[PDB]
């Protein structure tokens, strides 16, 4: 199933075989599938980072375009 990790990302969680149910398994409950409040800052950075990535590739493309103009 799709689950949210402690980093705020949504990732597919593959289920594991256990002899006891989840509620009787404290260790499985010990595993954290919830995001902490401080991840809100990270989420904004991810959106900004994605926007930054688009800018960087465009800058990278511009440098490659210089080669086209320079060669021809």
């Amino acid at each position: 199933a799709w689950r949210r990790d402690i980093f705020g990302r949504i990732v597919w969680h593959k289920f594991k075989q256990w002899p006891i149910p989840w509620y009787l398994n404290k260790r499985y409950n010990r595993r954290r599938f919830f995001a902490m409040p401080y991840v809100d800052r990270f989420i904004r950075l991810r959106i900004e980072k994605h926007a930054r990535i688009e800018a960087r590739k465009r800058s990278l493309q511009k440098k490659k375009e210089k080669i086209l103009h320079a060669k021809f």
Partner: protein
Amino acid sequence: AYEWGVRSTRKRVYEIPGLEPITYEGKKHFVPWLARPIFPPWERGWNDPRFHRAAPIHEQTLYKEEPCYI
């Protein structure tokens, strides 16, 4: 008498009628923002000695009211 044992180590939505509160049972893991489910008895399907517990003495067929001193 002196008390032995440091004190440090010493030990709504549900009430609404006609509806059942949502719980993280579907999630299969605890989350603070969902209600704690009430779980019915679990059935392993086989006997595990490591987790098996001996039956009480009184329920034994050989239990006798008279005390036998050995």
